């Protein structure tokens, strides 16, 4: 006789019939039985021992929920609300939000707490957190129209006072509440309905989750999953624009395409699938080829090989750029593709001078001047960059090692 | 996924060329916006609800339909009981009037 | 499709209940006419 | 109060 | 005591969570 | 009812081991599949975790004692271990994890 029961012993058969009529939703029996019963009691007596309102909301009966919500003696009403938001029933949620005691905000002690203690959904979760947690758009919209905004996670390192108070004797549930609210702000429903524009808040919150993934050693997988969900929200939002006006509002926002820092910020924060999209790739090619369209439409990379072979000769382009700017070749020489073909080509003639120096004074001086040009290019490169940023790339090291060995 | 990472590394690659003019390896001797946001958010919400619709089924929904059908049962049968009661009231009033 | 079936079942609910209301109204019309005839 | 709404304010209950 | 109460809370959570997990999985033609 | 014992002949177990044979092992693994499931484990005893561990190692022993049906005893013991893991996973407070 070790079995556990919610009620000590099954008591009333009449109240048990009331519960069996509230479970399967027999409205006339509970309507006729509302008035003529001795008292309307919280029945429980189940495996989970839910109330009649709770048991009726679990199964979606709107008429018996409306009938019970007028009894005024009910309990667990808030717990029934979090349950109905979990199940995703909109009619029941709006019928409960108009109940008494729910005027103004009730959101954000002795509330919910079904069966005398030990409520569900972690006891730190308010209605809106569970609403955006389940991706319920209508319910999130109704709760936001009533003015329930999610609280901020606060800060990880900041002790403050109440955060330090809840860090001792409450511990290990503090991180659970942190990642719970963070799962709250990170979902498409709250991101789209909450703010003025989604994309800015989504990017900023994405890099913040990326920082708090590394700051906290535990739960790093989960923070990774939330940040990735956010990045996918942004990618999915840019994917849905069918016109150039909308793609320019998503990419740039408020000399080609001036004031483009948002893509710069997107590659700074390492959003992978935002910059790889076909629309964004089309934009960046439009800025990448720029003044020269003829090669943008060119047939094969072999024509680009002949183009890099004809760009190999310095004297024409260098003499032009030095003596006069802003010619036709002056407008062309300023461009994203031309600096690339010229830089790469001159690298190839450096290799060629290496091979011809090896096969059999002048080659010496030329190669020396070339590695001096490389070390000056690394002067201008390391100028703008802090020692840590310069050393971030493994290859950015090996390059300096190469030119240094040449100097030695 | 490899194509996405390649597109990204490429984006860094030729993205590094936009900011500053670099001549050579030889440097010798030198409103509407808000409207668009409303349209995009509206499209995204509706598309998200369609995407929610498209994915499979939940057995709990079938439990839900069952409960609704049973509630319909009881409600219609009770409407039958009330109609028959009022009818019998009528009939018996008539039979008392004729007697 | 399940949302669709739900909506149809609810429409059936309301329609049948309203047919009940109309039938009860016409019935009460009959009955009261009878009771006025007997009085 | 940055939420977007289709109607400026909810008007008629009927 | 406290231990028994905790066992009741854990068993209740596990039962309800198990019924939700049963709900979440597909359909039966029957 | 308990599975009784594999090696013990007793009287009624020996009576059902002859002329009833090969259905005896079927009844054994059937009842063992009975005690091994989350419903009976959670509702049956005072605390689930102790009975689940003890029954898990007992199924691990009877997997090696009996050469046949070793795969199925492995599956039942693994189902039990997963019941315990799933039960420890659901505690949201330090008091409950302790």
CB contact under 8 A, E22 and B59: yes
With residue A152 as reference, give the H or E element that holds it: none
Note whether F38 contacts E18, CB cutoff 8 Å: yes
The DSSP call for residue A151 is P
- Of all helices (H) and strands (E), which one includes residue A127? helix A127-133
Residue in chain A lying closest to E12 (CA): A48
- In degrees, rounded to 5, the angle at the alpha carbon of residue E16 between the alpha carbons of residues E13 and E18 is 105
Rg of chain C on CA atoms, in Å: 17
Q: Return the residue matching tokens 């959670």.
A: F42
Q: Minimal Cα distance from A177: which residue of F?
A: F92
Q: In 10 A of CB B82, how many CB atoms?
A: 12
Helix (H) or strand (E) holding A88: none
Report how far residue F62's alpha carbon sits from residue F70's, in angstroms, rounded to the nearest whole number: 8
Instruction: Confirm if A137 and A193 have CB atoms less than 8 A apart.
Output: yes
Rounded Cα–Cα distance for residues F11 and F9 (Å) = 6
- Note whether A26 contacts B48, CB cutoff 8 Å: no
CB A357, CB B44: distance < 8 Å? no
In this structure, chain E runs to a length of 30
Under 8 Å between Cβ of A406 and A371: yes
Q: Which residues of E touch F91 (CB under 8 A)?
A: 10, 13
E22 CB burial (10 A radius; 0-12, 13-18, 19+): exposed
CB-based contact, A308 to chain D, within 8 Å = no
Residue A251 · residue A280 · CB < 8 Å = yes
Cα distances from A294 to residues A117, A155, A289, A298, in angstroms, run 75, 54, 9, 6
Is E27 in contact with B57 (Cβ distance < 8 A)? yes
Give the C-alpha separation, A60 to A64, whole Å: 9
The DSSP annotation for chain F comes to -----SS--TTHHHHHHSSSTTSHHHHHHHHHHHHTSHHHHHHHSS-HHHHHHHHHHHHHHHHHH-STTHHHHHHHHHHHHHHHHHHHHT--SHHHH-
Judged by CB atoms within 8 Å, which residues 29-68 of F form the interface with E?
A: 38, 42-43, 46-48
Query: Can you tell me the distance from the alpha carbon of F5 to that of F19, in angstroms, rounded to the nearest whole number?
Result: 19
**What method was applied to determine this entry?**
cryo-EM
What span, in angstroms and rounded, lies between the C-alpha atoms of F67 and A238? 61
Q: Most distant CA pair in chain C: distance in Å?
A: 57
User: Is F2 near chain A, with CB under 8 Å?
Assistant: no
Q: How many CB atoms lie within 10 A of CB F88?
A: 12
C-alpha radius of gyration, chain A, whole number: 34
Q: Chain B partners of A28 at a C-beta cutoff of 8 Å?
A: 74-75, 78
Query: What is the DSSP code string of A352-395?
Result: HHHHHHHH--HHHHHHHHHHHHHHHHHHHHHHHS-HHHHTSSHH
Closest by Cα among A110, A92, A5 to A47: A5
Give the span between the Cα atoms of A344 and A338, in whole angstroms. Answer: 10
Chain position carrying tokens 């003829």: A294
Give the dihedral sign, CA A368/A369/A370/A375.
positive
Chain E residue nearest residue A3, CA to CA: E8
| Cross-chain CB nearest to A137 (options B17, B48, B64) | B48
> For B58, which residue in chain A has the nearest alpha carbon?
A87
Please indicate whether chains B and F are in contact, defined as at least 3 beta carbon pairs under 8 Å.
no
Helices (H), chain B: 2-15, 32-53, 59-98
Q: For residues A375 and A407, is the Cβ–Cβ distance under 8 A? A: yes
Tokens of F20: 């009833």
CB atoms E10 and F96 under 8 Å: yes
Torsion of CA A80, A86, A90, A93, to 10 degrees: 20
């Amino acid at each position: 006789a070790y079995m556990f029961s919610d009620r000590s012993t099954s008591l009333s058969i009449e109240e048990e019939r009331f519960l069996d009529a509230a479970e399967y939703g027999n409205i006339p029996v509970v309507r006729k039985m509302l008035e003529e019963c001795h008292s309307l009691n919280v029945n429980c007596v189940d495996y989970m021992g839910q109330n009649a309102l709770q048991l009726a909301v679990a199964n979606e009966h709107l008429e018996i929920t409306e009938l019970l919500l007028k009894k005024e003696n009910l309990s667990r009403v808030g717990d029934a609300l979090l349950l109905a938001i979990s199940k995703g029933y909109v009619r029941i949620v709006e019928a409960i939000l108009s109940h008494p005691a729910f005027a103004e905000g009730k959101r954000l002690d002795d509330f919910y707490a079904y069966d005398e203690d030990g409520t569900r959904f972690s006891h730190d979760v308010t209605p809106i957190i569970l609403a955006a947690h389940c991706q319920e758009y209508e319910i999130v919209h109704t709760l936001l129209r009533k003015g329930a905004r999610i609280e901020r996670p606060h800060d990880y390192f900041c002790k403050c006072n109440d955060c330090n108070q809840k860090q001792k004797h409450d511990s290990f549930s503090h991180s659970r509440s942190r990642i719970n609210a963070y799962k709250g702000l990170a979902s498409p429903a709250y991101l789209s309905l909450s703010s003025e524009d989604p994309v800015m808040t989504a990017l900023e919150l994405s890099n913040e989750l990326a920082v708090l993934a590394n700051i906290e050693k535990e739960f790093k997988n989960d923070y990774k999953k939330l940040s990735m969900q956010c990045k996918d929200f942004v990618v999915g939002l840019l994917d849905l624009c069918r016109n150039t006006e909308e793609v320019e509002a998503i990419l740039n926002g408020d000399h080609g395409r001036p004031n483009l820092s948002r893509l710069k910020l997107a590659i700074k924060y390492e959003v992978k699938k935002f910059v790889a999209h076909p629309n964004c790739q089309q934009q960046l090619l439009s800025i990448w080829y720029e003044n020269l369209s003829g090669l943008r439409q060119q047939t094969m990379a072999v024509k680009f090989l002949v183009v890099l072979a004809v760009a190999i000769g310095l004297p024409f382009l260098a003499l032009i750029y030095w003596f006069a700017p802003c010619s036709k070749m002056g407008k062309i020489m300023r461009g994203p593709f031309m600096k690339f073909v010229a830089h790469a080509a001159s690298f190839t003639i450096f290799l060629g001078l290496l091979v011809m120096n090896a096969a059999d004074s002048w080659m010496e001086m030329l190669i020396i001047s070339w590695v001096i040009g490389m070390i000056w290019a690394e002067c201008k490169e390391i100028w703008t960059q802090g020692p840590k940023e310069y050393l971030f790339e493994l290859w950015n090291m090996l390059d300096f090692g190469m030119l240094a060995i040449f100097a030695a | 996924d490899a194509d996405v990472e390649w597109k990204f590394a490429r984006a860094k690659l030729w993205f590094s060329y936009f900011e500053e003019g670099r001549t050579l390896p030889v440097p010798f001797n030198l409103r509407q916006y808000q409207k668009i946001m409303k349209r995009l958010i509206k499209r995204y919400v509706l598309q998200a609800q369609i995407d929610k619709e498209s994915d499979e089924v939940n057995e709990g929904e079938l439990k839900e339909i069952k409960q609704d059908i049973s509630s319909l049962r009881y409600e219609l049968l009770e409407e039958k009981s009330q109609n028959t009661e009022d009818l019998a009231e009528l009939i018996r009033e008539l039979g008392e009037k004729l007697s």
